[PDB]
């Protein structure tokens, strides 16, 4: 019973750590807050008036973070043995060779060295701690598995590359032209439109709707031109956010519809059954022939799985309809051929 409970608790910990799902996310949320708090405290340590209490709080929270993080590292290393891929000392070393595991252990060691340096309290140590207080963000970086956020953003951006390039190109042209016209009408009356660089800064601040107010047109012709070009360029500069948001929402809807279905179940069952038959396969030459046939079927099932790796889409339903229509049509052709042979 001891082995069963050991493996069950190991699997539960490996689940809550490496493959979060549902309430497990709670834990990660907690750790995120912790990291975030540290960052905030670091930001509050750069303010000369608040540096004292912020530094003390950062020391206490740095200790707490060290304890909790090392505990998490040890628990993750232990729970890596839930799956036999990382079982044993060799398997644990293979787990420790993962890039994010090595990133976590160097972050831990850097934090330990930071604590030791603060205990020493040297000037070079103080500069090193000020520089290395930023390393904690790497943990937050580790959260998205294999850069999922970056991959999703890149996929959506690349899908809409032409539209984004169009929006930015026309917005840049509008910016240049509007800045030049406002510069021409505002040269002599406004001292903040002395050069074209000033007008370009004003146009960038205006068409982005930032509106600092450090530069503003004072002449009425300048204000009319600013209003018209503001309407145009403001419409143009907000375009990328709308394009990307609508693309994200459409992708989410498509993923929901796709997930709703299920495709790889049959190829997975075929792979499992052919693997089982090949495993059970081992005159004796005829038995070896059967083994080869089973391995051949295994390779076919593997290729079918590989080709079904692609998710469902409109072409899949279209070709399913085509297959059904062709089957019906050919079967009715055979039926009427038989019926006319009967009549003939």
């Amino acid at each position: 019973r001891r082995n069963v409970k050991y493996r069950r608790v190991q699997n539960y910990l490996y689940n809550v750590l490496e493959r979060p799902r549902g309430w497990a996310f709670i834990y990660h949320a907690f750790v995120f807050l912790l990291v975030f708090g540290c960052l905030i405290l670091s930001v509050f340590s750069t303010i000369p008036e608040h540096t004292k209490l912020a530094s003390s709080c950062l020391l206490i929270l740095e200790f707490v973070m060290i304890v909790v993080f090392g505990l998490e590292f040890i628990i993750r290393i232990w729970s890596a043995g839930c799956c036999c891929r990382y079982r044993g000392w060799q398997g644990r070393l293979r787990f420790a060779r993962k890039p994010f595991c090595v990133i976590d252990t160097i972050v831990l060691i850097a934090s330990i060295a930071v604590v030791s340096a603060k205990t020493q309290g040297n000037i070079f140590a103080t500069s090193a701690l000020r520089s290395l207080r930023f390393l904690q963000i790497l943990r937050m970086v580790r959260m998205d598995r294999r850069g999922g956020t970056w991959k999703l953003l890149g996929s959506v951006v690349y899908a809409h590359s032409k539209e984004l390039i169009t929006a930015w190109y026309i917005g840049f042209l509008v910016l240049i032209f509007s800045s030049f016209l406002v510069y021409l009408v505002e040269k002599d009356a406004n001292k903040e439109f002395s050069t074209y660089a000033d007008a370009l800064w004003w146009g960038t601040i205006t068409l982005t709707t930032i509106g600092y107010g450090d530069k503003t047109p004072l002449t009425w012709l300048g204000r009319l031109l600013s209003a018209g070009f503001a309407l145009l360029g403001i419409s143009f500069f907000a375009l990328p956010a709308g394009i990307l948001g609508s693309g994200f929402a459409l992708k989410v809807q498509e993923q929901h519809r796709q997930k709703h279905f299920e495709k790889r179940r049959n190829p997975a069952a075929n792979l499992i059954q052919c693997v089982w038959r090949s495993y059970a396969a081992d005159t004796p030459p005829l038995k070896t022939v059967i083994r080869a046939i089973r391995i051949m079927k295994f390779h076919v099932a593997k290729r079918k799985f590989k080709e079904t790796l692609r998710p469902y889409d409109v072409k899949d339903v279209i070709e399913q309809y085509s297959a059904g229509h062709l089957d019906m049509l050919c079967r009715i052709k055979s039926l009427q051929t038989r019926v006319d042979q009967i009549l003939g």
Partner: protein, 144 residues
């Protein structure tokens, strides 16, 4: 090497049965009929399309040599088998239940004899409240 090629040649001697050097649909249909596997034209043609790359319908001897010289103990085979097993996973706990696998294997996909169901039940550890992990199965079947 020499043992391997000798085994391959002695197998292809029965596979081909003459000096043609190529296997047709009937050539292996006779083989599956001898074993009582009930060969079918559609499945045989699908297998044929799974080997050739030119669409001529004939399995070339160099193509057979190339496709067979390589082994199934490849790196991506482990990942593909892991994903296939994960398709039949509940809540992603990395285990396959006795009742769940018993139902899936016999019902879903190609049917399996209940004798082989008792075979794999007794092959794995009967302990653990009837729960067996499949990662070790992938590990042992990938490298044979």
């Amino acid at each position: 090497t020499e043992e391997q090629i000798a085994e391959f040649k002695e197998a292809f001697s029965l596979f081909d049965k003459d000096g043609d050097g190529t296997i047709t649909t009937k050539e292996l249909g006779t083989v599956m009929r001898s074993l009582g596997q009930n060969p079918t034209e559609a499945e045989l043609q699908d297998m044929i399309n799974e080997v050739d790359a030119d669409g001529n319908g004939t399995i070339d001897f160099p193509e057979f040599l190339t496709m067979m010289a390589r082994k199934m103990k490849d790196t991506d085979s482990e990942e593909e088998i892991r994903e296939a097993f994960r398709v039949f996973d509940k809540d992603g706990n990395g285990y396959i239940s006795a009742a769940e696998l018993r139902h899936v294997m016999t019902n879903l996909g190609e049917k399996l004899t209940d004798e082989e169901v008792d075979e794999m039940i007794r092959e794995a550890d009967i302990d653990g409240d009837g729960q067996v992990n499949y990662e070790e199965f992938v590990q042992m079947m990938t490298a044979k």
